[PDB]
Design a protein around this ligand. Sequence first.
Ligand code: NAP
Ligand code: NAP
Lengths: 256, 257
Amino acid sequence: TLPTVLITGASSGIGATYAERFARRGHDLVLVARDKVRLDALAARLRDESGVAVEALQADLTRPADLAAVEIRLREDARIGILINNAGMAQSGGFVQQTAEGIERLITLNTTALTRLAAAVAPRFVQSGTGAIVNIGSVVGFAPEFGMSIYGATKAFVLFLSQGLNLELSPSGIYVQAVLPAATRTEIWGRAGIDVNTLPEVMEVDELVDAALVGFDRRELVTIPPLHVAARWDALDGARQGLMSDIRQAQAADRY
Amino acid sequence: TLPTVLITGASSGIGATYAERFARRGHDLVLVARDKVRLDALAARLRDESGVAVEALQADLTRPADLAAVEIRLREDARIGILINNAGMAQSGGFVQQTAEGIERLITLNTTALTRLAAAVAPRFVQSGTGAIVNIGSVVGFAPEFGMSIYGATKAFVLFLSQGLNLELSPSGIYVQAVLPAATRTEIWGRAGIDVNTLPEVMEVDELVDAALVGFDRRELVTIPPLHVAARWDALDGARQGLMSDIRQAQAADRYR
Ligand SMILES: NC(=O)c1ccc[n+]([C@@H]2O[C@H](COP(=O)([O-])OP(=O)(O)OC[C@H]3O[C@@H](n4cnc5c(N)ncnc54)[C@H](OP(=O)(O)O)[C@@H]3O)[C@@H](O)[C@H]2O)c1
Ligand SMILES: NC(=O)c1ccc[n+]([C@@H]2O[C@H](COP(=O)([O-])OP(=O)(O)OC[C@H]3O[C@@H](n4cnc5c(N)ncnc54)[C@H](OP(=O)(O)O)[C@@H]3O)[C@@H](O)[C@H]2O)c1
């Protein structure tokens, strides 16, 4: 029997296409987002088209009580063996046009909620010796130049967390994937007050998810569909380790 | 007249040494942390020894009302021209031993509060055409191997935010520095349930801060005192840009069909 997949941000975009795709592979699903009505239509379609069980679970992951209720479900339901931590939003406007409320929301959703859901399944996954956590990062986490300083910071967070979780949890049989899209045709752009049609280039959501799932089936750790030269990843990671090899912690460097 | 410095996490460790050092340079100070009694003693010492004004400002930066009150003070007080976003904590235990409450606290302090205080001064700094934001990251943000997956993530956040803020704000005359210590002899270790004496090597807090301040005086963007070969930073940043140069966004790469 195939594991049930809990997907956050399942109501649209990358989340919704993951849901469609996993339903077509034969997995039962738990779909979470705020828009209950839209989730109930999507769930019904997938139950009908694919014959799997699909539950629509309303939750605002920036509301403490909703998040806690999703944590509970992840801790307690042994059927759930794949977590897609996909729910996320971009930044609207530059740094000075940010608000305290907006910063709170962006960080809580993209970072705190994602990390907490992963922490809700990890103990159970360790005990069973199996499980999968797919975290959606972004190419923007490599690009302070893109101009979304906070959002990009949240996505650097998600990449790093994913790397760290792999090292901690793969020895207990857990797969931890970071998936890093670049511009993809979803509701994120309009949510942030950007017209998606003004971006030079944008990937279709079907093509991104199928690429991501090729990565998933190969059990790839870091999956970057729009990166046309794979070895740039290895070179980035090498330079990171290279830097780490020349840390001497007892004394400040001569130049200081 | 020299700008007043607001320092978070001023009651001990790196924050407290920054406070001592900036007081000796002649700056007035606003010191923030939870331990009011300890802040009042430090403030009194610095007023007496150095003859600058020093205000002790109690705040738990994980409590919404306290954080909002510090934001207000940063927005409204034109004297404050340097922000040291130093308050932070490490992770206690591995990922499976984490708690919802502990995750909330660690991320809120190291990330949300830091970002919000920076956002509280930036508009005023942009308007005045001057100002400085010093964010304390960590070498651990380069090291998923170190085993603190959440804490390290918060420090990858702080580095990235710093880089982004530099590009957004230096054109308006703002200096944004990321300071990245490695193991340094402060209260962070005991807070996390680690005996600092079991670490192979640990830098004295005086030496770290003085190194950081050499960086600050040279207006260096990314300052990593324990990195003995500077060019490893440039090579990391190059590889990052190298990767960015080979992103083609319309189509998935051949290896994914
Ligand atoms: N260009 C791209 O699309 C792109 C590129 C790289 C990475 N990403 C990442 O991809 C992920 C998916 O976003 P998308 O592109 O698929 O955008 P999307 O169409 O806006 O989907 C976002 C999903 O997250 C849910 N969500 C938003 N706020 C929420 C909240 N407070 N609580 C619970 N759920 C919430 C949304 O449903 P409700 O609004 O009904 O809650 C929606 O299903 C994000 O993490 C994003 O950072 C996107
Ligand atoms: N090895 C290292 O020490 C090392 C290496 C790299 C980076 N860092 C970074 O250096 C920074 C300073 O830490 P440290 O090494 O100096 O440790 P520290 O001695 O524990 O100092 C932490 C300071 O932040 C304050 N703080 C803690 N929780 C707080 C809260 N909720 N609200 C407001 N303030 C709070 C503390 O005072 P109260 O508890 O009285 O509130 C204290 O003044 C951190 O951002 C840390 O991540 C440290």
